[PDB]
């Protein structure tokens, strides 16, 4: 998986920086030019998503009593189910990650900092393993960045 | 996600941008 490790490192970092509230000081070295650009975009849009839907988000994080790793694998599924209607777009995609972030904050909050990495993987695994050909038809992370340019 | 909340937010985030592009 060439352009998946690039997705993985994007989601892990956004989620880690959100949980830890501070930006990481090490360069994002396995996403390169393409992937660092989208992190800049993701930070921008995902923080608005989080801020715009803070109540909706909070409502859902409640219902999914989120503790161990299986709760994470379970959430992965919910996310798979989002796209069942046959529709794929970045709004969805980003919203999925923004929620990751939200949840990841909660995880560090409830002393489960180490469930944040399994969470990142599933999100990545969800998208890339289920929506490979949609992602590809958009020039991947480049499309993400051009969608949210504004 | 009994009520399609995340999808519907996804689509709203997509709508707002669409109307911005």
UniProtKB/Swiss-Prot annotation, chain A:
A motif (BH2) lies at residues 133-148. GO terms for molecular function: BH3 domain binding; channel activity; protein heterodimerization activity; protein transmembrane transporter activity. Keywords: Apoptosis, Cytoplasm, Developmental protein, Differentiation, Isopeptide bond, Membrane, Mitochondrion, Nucleus, Phosphoprotein, Transmembrane, Transmembrane helix, Ubl conjugation. Cleaved by CASP3 during apoptosis. One of its GO terms (cellular component) is membrane. A motif (BH1) lies at residues 81-101. A motif (BH3) lies at residues 38-52. Its main location: membrane. GO terms for biological process: cell fate determination; cellular homeostasis; DNA damage response; extrinsic apoptotic signaling pathway in absence of ligand; intrinsic apoptotic signaling pathway in response to DNA damage; mitochondrial fusion; negative regulation of anoikis; negative regulation of apoptotic process. Induction: Expression increases early during phorbol ester-induced differentiation along the monocyte/macrophage pathway in myeloid leukemia cell line ML-1. Rapidly up-regulated by CSF2 in ML-1 cells. Up-regulated by heat shock-induced differentiation. Expression increases early during retinoic acid-induced differentiation. It is found in: Membrane; Cytoplasm; Mitochondrion; Nucleus, Nucleoplasm. Interacts with HIF3A (via C-terminus domain). Interacts with BAD, BOK, BIK and BMF. Interacts with PMAIP1. Interacts with BBC3. Isoform 1 interacts with BAX, BAK1 and TPT1. Heterodimer of isoform 1 and isoform 2. Homodimers of isoform 1 or isoform 2 are not detected. Isoform 2 does not interact with pro-apoptotic BCL2-related proteins. Interacts with RTL10/BOP. Interacts with BCL2L11; may sequester BCL2L11 to prevent its pro-apoptotic activity. Interacts with GIMAP5 and HSPA8/HSC70; the interaction between HSPA8 and MCL1 is impaired in the absence of GIMAP5. Belongs to the Bcl-2 family. Involved in the regulation of apoptosis versus cell survival, and in the maintenance of viability but not of proliferation. Mediates its effects by interactions with a number of other regulators of apoptosis. Isoform 1 inhibits apoptosis. Isoform 2 promotes apoptosis. This is Induced myeloid leukemia cell differentiation protein Mcl-1. It comes from Homo sapiens. The chain holds residues 209 to 321 of 350 of the full protein.
From Swiss-Prot, chain B:
Induction: Up-regulated after exposure to ionizing radiation and other genotoxic agents. Up-regulation is mediated by p53. Keywords: Apoptosis, Mitochondrion, Repeat. Its main location: mitochondrion. Changing residue 6 to A: Loss of pro-apoptotic activity and of targeting to mitochondria. One of its GO terms (cellular component) is Bcl-2 family protein complex. It comes from the Eukaryota. Detected in thymocytes after irradiation with X-rays. Not detectable in untreated thymocytes (at protein level). Detected in embryonic neural precursor cells of the telencephalon Constitutively expressed at low levels in adult brain, testis, thymus, spleen, lung and kidney. It is found in: Mitochondrion. The keyword Mitochondrion applies. One of its GO terms (biological process) is negative regulation of mitochondrial membrane potential. A motif (BH3 2) lies at residues 6-14. Belongs to the PMAIP1 family. The BH3 motif is essential for pro-apoptotic activity. Interacts with MCL1. Interacts with BCL2A1. Interacts with BAX. Interacts with BCL2L10. Promotes activation of caspases and apoptosis. Promotes mitochondrial membrane changes and efflux of apoptogenic proteins from the mitochondria. Contributes to p53/TP53-dependent apoptosis after radiation exposure. Promotes proteasomal degradation of MCL1. Competes with BIM/BCL2L11 for binding to MCL1 and can displace BIM/BCL2L11 from its binding site on MCL1. Competes with BAK1 for binding to MCL1 and can displace BAK1 from its binding site on MCL1. This is Phorbol-12-myristate-13-acetate-induced protein 1. It comes from Mus musculus (Mouse). The lineage of its organism: Eukaryota, Metazoa, Chordata, Craniata, Vertebrata. The chain holds residues 73 to 93 of 103 of the full protein.
């Amino acid at each position: 998986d060439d352009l998946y490790r690039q997705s993985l490192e994007i989601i892990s970092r956004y989620l880690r920086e959100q949980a830890t509230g501070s930006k990481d000081s090490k360069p994002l070295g396995e996403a390169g030019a393409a992937g660092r650009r989208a992190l800049e975009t993701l930070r921008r849009v995902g923080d608005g998503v989080q801020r715009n839907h803070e109540t909706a988000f909070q409502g859902m994080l409640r219902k999914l009593d989120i503790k161990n790793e299986d709760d994470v694998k379970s959430l992965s599924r919910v996310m798979i189910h989002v796209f069942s209607d046959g529709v794929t777009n970045w709004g969805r995609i980003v919203t999925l990650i923004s929620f990751g972030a939200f949840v990841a904050k909660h995880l560090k909050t409830i002393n489960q900092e180490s469930c944040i990495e399994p969470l990142a993987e599933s999100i990545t695994d969800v998208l890339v393993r289920t929506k490979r050909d949609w992602l590809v038809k958009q020039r991947g992370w480049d499309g993400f960045v051009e969608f949210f340019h504004v | 996600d009994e009520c399609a909340q995340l999808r519907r937010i996804g689509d709203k985030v997509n709508l707002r941008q669409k109307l911005l592009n």
